Amino acid sequence: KKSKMIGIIIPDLNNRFYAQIIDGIQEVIQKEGYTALISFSTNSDVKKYQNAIINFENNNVDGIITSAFTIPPNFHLNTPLVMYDSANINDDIVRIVSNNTKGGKESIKLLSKKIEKVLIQHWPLSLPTIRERIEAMTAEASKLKIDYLLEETPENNPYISAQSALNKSNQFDAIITVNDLYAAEIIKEAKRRNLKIPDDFQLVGYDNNILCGYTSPTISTIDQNPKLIGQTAAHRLLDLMSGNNSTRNSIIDVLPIKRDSTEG
Amino acid sequence: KKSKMIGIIIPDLNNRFYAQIIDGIQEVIQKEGYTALISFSTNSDVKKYQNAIINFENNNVDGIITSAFTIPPNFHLNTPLVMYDSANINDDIVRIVSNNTKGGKESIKLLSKKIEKVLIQHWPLSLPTIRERIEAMTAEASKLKIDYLLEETPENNPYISAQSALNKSNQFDAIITVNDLYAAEIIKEAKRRNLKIPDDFQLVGYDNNILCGYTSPTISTIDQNPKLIGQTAAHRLLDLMSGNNSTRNSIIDVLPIKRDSTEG
Numbered sequence: 001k002k003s004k005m006i007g008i009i010i011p012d013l014n015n016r017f018y019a020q021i022i023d024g025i026q027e028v029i030q031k032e033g034y035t036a037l038i039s040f041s042t043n044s045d046v047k048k049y050q051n052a053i054i055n056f057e058n059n060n061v062d063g064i065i066t067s068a069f070t071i072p073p074n075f076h077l078n079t080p081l082v083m084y085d086s087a088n089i090n091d092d093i094v095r096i097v098s099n100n101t102k103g104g105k106e107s108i109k110l111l112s113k114k115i116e117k118v119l120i121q122h123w124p125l126s127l128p129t130i131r132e133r134i135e136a137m138t139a140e141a142s143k144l145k146i147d148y149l150l151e152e153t154p155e156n157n158p159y160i161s162a163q164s165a166l167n168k169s170n171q172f173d174a175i176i177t178v179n180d181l182y183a184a185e186i187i188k189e190a191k192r193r194n195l196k197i198p199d200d201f202q203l204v205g206y207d208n209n210i211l212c213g214y215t216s217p218t219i220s221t222i223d224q225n226p227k228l229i230g231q232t233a234a235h236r237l238l239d240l241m242s243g244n245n246s247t248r249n250s251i252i253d254v255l256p257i258k259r260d261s262t263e264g
Numbered sequence: 265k266k267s268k269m270i271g272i273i274i275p276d277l278n279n280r281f282y283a284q285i286i287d288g289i290q291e292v293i294q295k296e297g298y299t300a301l302i303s304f305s306t307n308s309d310v311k312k313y314q315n316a317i318i319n320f321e322n323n324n325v326d327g328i329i330t331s332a333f334t335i336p337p338n339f340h341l342n343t344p345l346v347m348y349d350s351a352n353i354n355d356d357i358v359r360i361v362s363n364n365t366k367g368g369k370e371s372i373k374l375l376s377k378k379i380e381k382v383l384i385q386h387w388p389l390s391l392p393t394i395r396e397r398i399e400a401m402t403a404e405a406s407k408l409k410i411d412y413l414l415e416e417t418p419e420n421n422p423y424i425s426a427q428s429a430l431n432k433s434n435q436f437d438a439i440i441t442v443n444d445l446y447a448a449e450i451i452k453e454a455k456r457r458n459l460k461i462p463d464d465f466q467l468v469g470y471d472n473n474i475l476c477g478y479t480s481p482t483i484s485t486i487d488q489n490p491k492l493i494g495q496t497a498a499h500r501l502l503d504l505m506s507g508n509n510s511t512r513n514s515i516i517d518v519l520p521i522k523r524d525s526t527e528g
Contacts, residue, residue: 013277013290023304037301215478215479
């Protein structure tokens with residue numbers, strides 16, 4: 001019956017965000033005698049996700065924890081499953097949802113009351129979690145009468161994104177970008193151009209990656225609580241494996257952290 | 265019968281070192297249809313390593329890849345095994361050995377010719393790989409007539425190590441510490457005390473973490489190519505699983521990287 005194995009799918013192993021989610025998962029499941037059977041994805045192909053899930057089932061895992069992907073019409077499995085890094089989707093799958101809406105709202109709230117124009121660089125809005133974040137940003141910006149420009153940026157090139165940001169920086173009072181690595185690249189390019197942050201413009205990133213406290217200026221950001229996302233995914237999975245049929249989503253809080261990139 | 269599962273033991277996936285080692289391992293084994301069964305260690309208890317190994321065997325894994333630990337007198341295993349993050353030990357266990365000797369030697373060579381006294385912070389020499397690194401450092405320092413002070417430092421406290429380093433920095437021309445995170449903490453503490461690097465003293469880290477290129481100054485360091493360490497561990501394991509009984513170790517080259525923290 002039970003294998004005491006939990007299947008886990010992780011998309012980006014080198015991102016400390018996913019590293020911390022896995023750390024949260026293992027902390028909870030290993031205490032209960034489970035061992036993680038982990039599959040690393042090469043890309044976000046839904047078919048590959050389904051295939052990974054099928055292989056987990058062939059190995060008789062007792063439960064599965066996977067990063068989110070759009071549920072296809074033919075989706076099917078007979079193993080308890082929890083989806084993390086998900087948007088607040090009200091379907092039959094238990095999802096661990098970071099409060100992306102609060103994240104976006106708080107990103108705008110980190111800006112000075114004197115900010116009149118902000119450049120918002122973002123990943124494709126086709127990504128549900130990003131759409132939630134950006135829609136909340138434009139809503140709060142509108143509430144505060146802060147003009148903005150949305151700019152979709154590449155998903156794997158912080159350098160190019162930083163050039164685009166600096167090229168138009170004199171048109172903005174602040175810049176909000178996709179994550180802290182992208183913010184770090186913006187800081188590096190600003191220095192190449194002899195521009196100062198926050199003097200010439202305020203800067204806000206996302207994640208609260210360890211990098212934030214080591215740059216100059218330090219980076220203002222939003223902490224996504226990845227460890228808690230992981231721990232919660234594990235607890236919710238254990239509940240499903242214990243006969244709890246609830247499909248309610250767990251909403252994980254996000255925390256705004258003010259550093260020198262906004263405060264000076 | 266084969267399970268097409270490979271047991272892997274690692275502390276976690278946060279640091280670049282372990283995340284990249286796993287990246288290297290998974291890249292090679294998934295290509296061959298294997299799935300990683302990963303046990304995360306909470307400490308360096310040899311007994312816990314042995315128990316983790318027994319659990320993998322009870323799960324019929326086809327091979328095991330683990331971080332290094334001192335082999336106890338009663339060590340016994342009937343499953344192919346490869347140890348990474350190992351010193352160059354000539355026993356019957358296949359080990360993937362980073363060239364710690366070269367790493368230590370090149371760390372001293374990163375210092376400017378003007379450097380006369382260096383503070384060398386290191387983890388306990390009871391750790392074989394660190395002993396190899398430090399012994400190479402003192403050998404090269406002696407060759408170049410550079411005076412030095414060896415200071416054992418905490419393994420889980422970059423902050424405390426940074427305070428110790430700065431409290432006596434006035435007595436040194438350069439400081440070499442355990443890794444780039446520790447180096448970053450030193451740069452941060454140096455800023456708190458209105459001291460500049462390399463101005464007041466040069467600095468060298470280890471690991472070539474992503475943050476090296478985003479700090480001010482950028483950090484000179486040693487890249488031990490963890491992805492290659494992982495890929496090699498997987499290749500050697502597949503060889504053992506193929507009847508190749510050689511127990512010779514694989515030595516992996518390192519690459520010193522000069523950045524602004526050692527610019528004279």
